A paper describes a structure:
The plasma protein α1-antitrypsin is principally synthesised by hepatocytes and protects lung tissue from degradation by inhibiting neutrophil elastase. It is the archetypal member of the serpin (serine protease inhibitor) superfamily of proteins. In common with other inhibitory serpins, the native fold of α1-antitrypsin is metastable and this property is utilised in the characteristic serpin mechanism of action.
The 2.2 Å crystal structure of [name] α1-antitrypsin adopts the classic structure of a serpin fold in the native conformation. The lack of perturbation elsewhere in the overall structure of [name] α1-antitrypsin implies that the mutation must be mediating its effect on the fold stability of native α1-antitrypsin from within the cavity flanking β-sheet A. The cavity is well defined in this high-resolution structure, permitting interpretation of the effect of the mutation on cavity filling at the side-chain level. The estimated size of this ideal pharmacophore is 59 Å3, equivalent to 22% of the total cavity volume in wild-type α1-antitrypsin. In order for α1-antitrypsin to adopt either M⁎ conformation, residue 114 must move laterally by 4.6 Å in the plane of β-sheet A. This is limited by local steric clashes in [name] α1-antitrypsin. The high-resolution structural characterisation of the [name] mutation presents a more precise pharmacophore target for screening of small fragments capable of mimicking its effects.
Residue numbers in the entry: 24 to 343, 352 to 393
Amino acid sequence: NKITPNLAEFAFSLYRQLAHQSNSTNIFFSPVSIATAFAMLSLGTKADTHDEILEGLNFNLTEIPEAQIHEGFQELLRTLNQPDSQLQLTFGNGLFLSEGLKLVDKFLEDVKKLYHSEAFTVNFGDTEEAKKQINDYVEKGTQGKIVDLVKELDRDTVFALVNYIFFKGKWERPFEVKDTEEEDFHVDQVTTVKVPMMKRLGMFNIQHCKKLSSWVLLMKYLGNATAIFFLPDEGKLQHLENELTHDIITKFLENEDRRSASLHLPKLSITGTYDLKSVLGQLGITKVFSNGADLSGVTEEAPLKLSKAVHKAVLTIDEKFLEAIPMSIPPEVKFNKPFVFLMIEQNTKSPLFMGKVVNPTQ
């Protein structure tokens, strides 16, 4: 609740960072999985090292008490890993520390207690074997969906962090597979490529927002989440990207109005892999990754730093009551060119995912 605004801001800061690099690859990550992981990590850091982290996650410490921060991440975690409820979400974070280091019990506690996360010890003396364990942890965690995540480890690595998330939720209102068919997806102003296109004619929470200069579609997932798709007008993609804000999103989530439209949405599966040291570094989080790292909350007498941090986010979208639709020409809304999207957990309103699809068949 209290940290939602901060998470929404971190999501935009990260997205805009990634968007500046490439403009051809499909951006896709979990602001929530990344933030939760480093907020947890900060519990083992002090002073500068500790503040760069929370500030890197868009938390102004001069205004928000640390207790409120961790408290927010904890209520959010309860929601995501609720036994009784749906969502069909698989995520996790793994901390791998060198054996031989004397860990501080308290840290290990809060990790497995407050953030209900996992901490492991490994022999980094054997680099190939260490990343095999790490990768097996991820693979096993994602039922084999995410394999060989970590490709390398420098030799002096004594602490590594892996954060993964896989989502394949079902729509509240399904698509007809028999209606799904190959269509052109415009990757350029004059170039096209074929992709499987799901389609449906019905009452949709959809509208053309003029401030974003793009179509905005909201669709509910089974459970407590909602997907938001933004289709920018010809040449308005980056205008869209710069205009996005938390309030604008909140507004869309408030609207309940539906209307008829023939929708064409691509059936796809996209992934996103990022080097957090490189990416979060550009966000000011560099201390915890340096030799000057103050991680006395993790190990007391020996020097320590986080030498490896990786994030992987995977999303699958497919076809997955009686409506009333008027017999008037409905708008045909085709997501057959680059678009942006957001996944919002309904309870906390936090941004579960965020990405851009420039090429579904990439």
